[PDB]
Ligand binder design. Structure first.
Ligand SMILES: CC(C)S[C@@H]1O[C@H](CO)[C@H](O)[C@H](O)[C@H]1O
Ligand SMILES: CC(C)S[C@@H]1O[C@H](CO)[C@H](O)[C@H](O)[C@H]1O
Ligand SMILES: [Mg+2]
Ligand SMILES: [Mg+2]
Ligand SMILES: [Mg+2]
Ligand SMILES: [Mg+2]
Ligand code: NA
Ligand code: NA
Ligand code: NA
Ligand code: NA
Ligand code: NA
Lengths: 1015, 211, 174
């Protein structure tokens, strides 16, 4: 019958004998436990060691397994994904379905997980009431047997499936048998861009309820105009036998204080001609001056729902955290408690590099802490309902949540093929309706989402209206079909750019500024996805935030995304390395596209995270003469855990510092006048830095937390004093092959065949391993690479244009190499042409001036042919002989920064270990650049000028040639890249050119100057 | 939905048709117990979607109905929007939950009187003249059922028609109903007679209310 | 499977193997016949004399009935309501359900109409294309078998239920 019906190939059967969905239950039999959220003896965990056997198909499972343990089975921890235990390979595919697209059919080879548990049930649980099993997450579908008897069936990987086991259990030893199918008709609705895994990956629990029970409860909070009065409305539903003596009490608590209470017998108001709900009641509680919930101040109350008898005997209690907040759209603005939100959001998948898609509390808290510490106030559940604890944590820590239905049909052609099909409406409706029924009481959830990347079908319109009808308290959004369809309250595009239109047919991505004012358009715009943080990315992130702040109806967005979906593999010596698509024999696959995070999989930050933090700052600063103006972007809180540290430094040398307490009302301004600063004697640029510091620890941060910072140039004194002339004079030695410059024991060698500084000497120690040459290329970032365009690779991608123009193959041709003796210096003049098969790409003209002081002044003038694609960089490189421990620089830092991602970096004197000047991106690329650098120190060398640089033990060539970071080997000496100019990194998306025009090297003629000397 | 030939005949002879989904849950307590329940949405959706897919090409079909006497539930709102989305060419009506809910483009009460209010709790039947001008109301009013023609009836039929002609937004209605649902039985003499509820041993029954 | 699954007591199962709904089809192989709305050779009526046996419950139906005619069956006109042929009583109730309100369950004593038809199919219909059966209205739910083999299931008394019979039919008698 089970093998005969094939319920996993029928979108009309999404469950059999599954109980109704509901908010989180614990069936407390003690009111104080419910109030204080203590554990409940009526809610047991079945997590721990289970038995597991893997089969290639459900037809291969022996019938004996229903009755007793398979000797061949292993003992595994549950929850788990079975790919994480190595029973088969996890698959990384983005858009293309991991199975042949033939709905509703799945492959006959369907990996099957056979889970079983032998466990005790006490007779007291069976003597009365109802015992149910709860599977919080099973991927992708499953049948359930209890003591050899079939119980039911479930689909939807991301919401709990519950079954009444009351008639199946015996007192004493019981056995569960769970047959989990990797593929089902549900998989067609689960095409999210992530690892495709399977198994019992979320909690399993047993819940005992009395026969007469609270079956559902809904909490709403409505307010007066100024939010000084609230009504809390609680609708309560029961199951079992109705009796006149039954009562529902709802009490509301602030800490240990009961704030309000209401009691009523069952019997709802008249609904229609047939009467009302005899099995429901609605309690209304008045609350004066409620403490309001926000991400800023997550004020929470506790509501306790008691089912009891008139004489005061408790039957059972349930409870939830209540956050008094109103979400509404009015006049084109999304308001929370009357105030326009600015969403500092991120998309977050549930991912662990060891445990796969199994979530644990520690990882969840770590993510929330890091989010809040980096000025995020909002998270999108991309693209499925989360582990239930996630919402409890967001309620308490204070984050705005977009709860999203587990529906994505990205790989369909066209994308709406299923979602326009009425045959798929039931299956889609359950994914939406069961999420709402589960999560509707969480205050952190402020917006519902209908799913992701499933086009726009009539099924979306139906389910949009269903949500609007059952829950008017939360806007509904959905991006599919062009981001502004009739199924969305919010214009919610993905990767729409700030100023640049991308007018695709049918589904254009308008520039976000333009989008708001299209004829007839009134809604708020919040990007559901933007700033694709794949690898070295988040270029142009500041452009988004400038527009967010300037335009009221641009209310932010959610970065894609939080955490790299890299998985851990082990080499022969047991050393872990980070793996991505294809590393498990999974094919077809989308390689490194699973890694788009602001943090690595182990939650170590990428440099891009600091740019996010800075741009999402909650205080804005302006400087006018002596006065600093601080503006608060908080909506609800005063700045009561904030002080402003200011610091004035001359070229990194502190000159004055101080601190002022911040007392800024929400949306307010404070004026801080600095003291009149003493005049510095020496030349250089004064820099003002201000930090906002949180003196007191919070639930989410340590004492001393820096939340905001800003820098300005103050007065500059130009160096006018003549460098007191040295008496020494360098000597020119000329041979046919070389120009050699000599000063004391210092020697500079210029090769006359190549035209490059080929070697330098201090005494008898060589300084270079490779000659100092021009470099116009970088090891391609993920943004440079893009995607494959079916029959070939996209010719529009930066890497493809560079390769086609012969940038990586370009060979230097010497045009001129001359030497001149001056009064107190030797002048070397060179010119090179870089050519590809007869076409001149670049001309470099250099002068090298070596004087008595031992300094070599390099002047570089470059012509770039207007018809060659703009080059990745205009700079010089060499492999230095020395490996030193520290790198010291006066410039932007301390972290990696690029021309379109350097707003977070500060100008100062920085000192780091060499290893910190390399960014360990899992997919290797150009990395570790620091911009606006005036002085660089490494070992015996000092370079001065105005440049960008990176420095590491890996050549651009190796980075370019290596697919994984663990495969990188330190080279002899140290590779130095010094750029006069470096192209932006982009990142608006990672599958098309995204470097903005002002960050491309398009000027045609470039000049930079550099001084190389010994320090 | 009717036998498919009905719509062909209405196309050709010329009658305006309200096509109505096969959903009536009158005997539930309260009336919307199933239609507000998301577990019943799939079964309900099929009765609406499959009607629209069958009948959408008939010119005689000018209005879609979501069913009859099933209260007002969230499933009605979903299915109302589904129809507006797939077929913008036809208004959608539904009488349940008070005749003027968010699930109807047309105020479509049953047995609302001309001048007399019937102020039932939750689901009042206002006078039709009064209903039109209720604060914020703009929709046309067309009675889905009026003038209950049971036996010696249609008293005051003129009163409806006077109002229909006078008020532009009173655009008429559908009499209840066309044909007596009596069945033929045979006695001892083998002579046919007209039978109603109870006459087949059927019990409980509602007697002559089928006529 | 059929008696075990009890699809008639499950609001999540409204059909099995039923084809998508669509506007009226006739599948004319001649454009002029289509234009003039004349009969189509590809649309046959199965109305007429069928075999029928009444049972008090689906459990009471003999397995043999799938394979061959039941001797106790009567020959009846279809389309028909079996109450009009006197097999059980038609019930007139207005609001109150004729069954106990206990959704989704129905009485165990659930009158069951066992219809059958022996009919012929042209060999040409089977050598090419797709042959479907169309039930314009069946009240209130039904399972369908063809040549002893289970085809599918349908609900909603007032809309056509269509099933693909191509793999079930043989040339000649079915
Ligand atoms: C590559 C695009 C055509 S689809 C693109 O893929 C991304 C890869 O991280 C994300 O999954 C985005 O949501 C999706 O729009
Ligand atoms: C008797 C009323 C309470 S219900 C009333 O019954 C009528 C009897 O013909 C019709 O069926 C109407 O549609 C219905 O509203
Ligand atoms: Mg299925
Ligand atoms: Mg996708
Ligand atoms: Mg704990
Ligand atoms: Mg059924
Ligand atoms: Na804004
Ligand atoms: Na991705
Ligand atoms: Na590489
Ligand atoms: Na009129
Ligand atoms: Na009647």
């Amino acid at each position: 019958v089970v093998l005969q019906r094939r319920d996993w190939e029928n979108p009309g059967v999404t469950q059999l004998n599954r109980l109704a969905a509901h908010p989180p239950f614990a069936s407390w039999r003690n009111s104080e436990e419910a109030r204080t959220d203590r554990p409940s003896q009526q809610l047991r965990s079945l997590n721990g060691e289970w038995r597991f056997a893997w089969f290639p198909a459900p037809e291969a499972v022996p019938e004996s397994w229903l009755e007793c343990d398979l000797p061949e089975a292993d003992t595994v921890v549950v929850p788990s994904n079975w790919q994480m235990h190595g029973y088969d390979a996890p698959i990384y595919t983005n858009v293309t379905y991991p199975i042949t697209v033939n709905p509703p059919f799945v492959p006959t080879e369907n990996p099957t997980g056979c889970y079983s548990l032998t466990f005790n049930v006490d007779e007291s649980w069976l003597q009365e009431g109802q015992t149910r099993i709860i599977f919080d997450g099973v991927n992708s579908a499953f049948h359930l047997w209890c003591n050899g008897r079939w119980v039911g069936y479930g689909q939807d990987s991301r919401l709990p499936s519950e079954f009444d086991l009351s008639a199946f259990l015996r007192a004493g030893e019981n056995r569960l048998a769970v047959m989990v199918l990797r593929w089902s008709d549900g998989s067609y609705l689960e095409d999210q861009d992530m690892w495709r895994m399977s198994g019992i990956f979320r909690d399993v629990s047993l819940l005992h309820k009395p026969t007469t029970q609270i079956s559902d409860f809904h909490v709403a909070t409505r307010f007066n105009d100024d939010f000084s009065r609230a009504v809390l409305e609680a609708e309560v539903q029961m199951c079992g036998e109705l009796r006149d003596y039954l009562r529902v009490t709802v009490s509301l608590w602030q800490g240990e204080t009961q704030v309000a209470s209401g009691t009523a017998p069952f019997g709802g108001e008249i609904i229609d001609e047939r009467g009302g709900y005899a099995d429901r009641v609605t309690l209304r509680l008045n609350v004066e001056n409620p403490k309001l919930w926000s991400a800023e101040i997550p004020n929470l109350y506790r509501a306790v729902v008691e089912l009891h008898t008139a004489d005061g005997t408790l039957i059972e209690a349930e409870a939830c955290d209540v956050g008094f907040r109103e979400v509404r759209i009015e006049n084109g603005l999304l308001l929370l408690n009357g105030k326009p939100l600015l969403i500092r959001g991120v998309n977050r998948h549930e991912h662990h590099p060891l445990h796969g898609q199994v979530m644990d509390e520690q990882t969840m808290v770590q993510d929330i802490l890091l989010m809040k510490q980096n000025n995020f106030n909002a998270v999108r559940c991309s693209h499925y309902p989360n582990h239930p604890l996630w919402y409890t944590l967001c309620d308490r820590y204070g984050l705005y949540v977009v709860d999203e239905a587990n529906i994505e049909t990205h790989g369909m052609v066209p994308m709406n093929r299923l979602t326009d099909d009425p045959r798929w409406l039931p299956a889609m409706s359950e994914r939406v309706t069961r999420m709402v029924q589960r999560d509707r009481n969480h205050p952190s959830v402020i917006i519902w989402s209908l799913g992701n990347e499933s086009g726009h079908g009539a099924n979306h319109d139906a389910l949009y209206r269903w949500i609007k009808s059952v829950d008017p308290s939360r806007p509904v959004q959905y991006e599919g079909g062009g981001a502004d369809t009739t199924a969305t309250d919010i214009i919610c595009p993905m990767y729409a750019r700030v100023d640049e239109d991308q007018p695709f047919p049918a589904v254009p991505k308008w520039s976000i500024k333009k989008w708001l004012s299209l004829p007839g358009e009134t809604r708020p715009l919040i990007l559901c996805e933007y700033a694709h943080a794949m690898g070295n990315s988040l270029g142009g992130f500041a452009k988004y935030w400038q527009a967010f702040r300037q335009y009221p109806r641009l209310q932010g967005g959610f970065v894609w995304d939080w955490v790299d979906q890299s998985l851990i593999k082990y080499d022969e010596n047991g050393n872990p390395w980070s793996a991505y698509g294809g590393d498990f024999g999974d094919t077809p696959n989308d390689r490194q596209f699973c890694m788009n995070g602001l943090v690595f999989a182990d939650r170590t930050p990428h440099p891009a995270l600091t740019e996010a933090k800075h741009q999402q700052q909650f205080f804005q600063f302006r400087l006018s003469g002596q006065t600093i103006e601080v503006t608060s972007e908080y909506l609800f809180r005063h700045s009561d855990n904030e002080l402003l540290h200011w610091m004035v430094a001359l070229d990194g040398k502190p000159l004055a510092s101080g601190e002022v307490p911040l007392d800024v009302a929400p949306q307010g301004k404070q004026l801080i006048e600095l003291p009149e600063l003493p005049q510095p004697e020496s030349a250089g640029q004064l820099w003002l830095t201000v930090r906002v510091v949180q003196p007191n620890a919070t639930a989410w941060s340590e004492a001393g937390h820096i939340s905001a910072w800003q820098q300005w140039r103050l007065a500059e004194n130009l160096s006018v004093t003549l460098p007191a002339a040295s008496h020494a004079i360098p000597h020119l030695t000329t041979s046919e092959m070389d120009f050699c410059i000599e000063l004391g024991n210092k020697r500079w060698q210029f090769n006359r065949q190549s035209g490059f500084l080929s070697q330098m000497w201090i005494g008898d120690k060589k300084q270079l391993l490779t000659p100092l040459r021009d470099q116009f290329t970088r090891a391609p970032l993920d943004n440079d690479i893009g995607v494959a365009e079916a029959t070939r690779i996209d010719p529009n991608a930066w890497v493809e244009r560079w390769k086609a123009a012969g940038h990586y193959q370009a060979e230097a041709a010497l045009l001129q190499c001359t030497a001149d003796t001056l009064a107190d210096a030797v002048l070397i003049t060179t010119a090179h042409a870089w050519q590809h098969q007869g076409k001149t790409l670049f001309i470099s003209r250099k002068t090298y001036r070596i004087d008595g002081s031992g300094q070599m002044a390099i002047t570089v003038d470059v012509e770039v042919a207007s018809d060659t694609p703009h080059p990745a960089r205009i700079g010089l490189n060499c492999q230095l002989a020395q490996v030193a421990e520290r790198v010291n620089w006066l410039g932007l830092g301390p972290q990696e920064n690029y021309p379109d991602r350097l707003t977070a970096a500060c100008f100062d004197r920085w000192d780091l270990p060499l290893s910190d000047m390399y960014t360990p991106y899992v997919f290797p690329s150009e990395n570790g650049l620091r911009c606006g650098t005036r002085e660089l120190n490494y070992g015996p060398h000092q370079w001065r000028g105005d440049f960008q640089f990176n420095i590491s033990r890996y050549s651009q060539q190796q980075l370019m040639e290596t697919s994984h970071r663990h495969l990188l080997h330190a080279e002899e000496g140290t590779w130095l890249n010094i750029d006069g100019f470096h192209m932006g990194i982009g990142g608006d998306d990672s599958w098309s050119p995204s470097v903005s025009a002002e960050f491309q090297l398009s000027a045609g003629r470039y000049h930079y100057q550099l001084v190389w000397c010994q320090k």
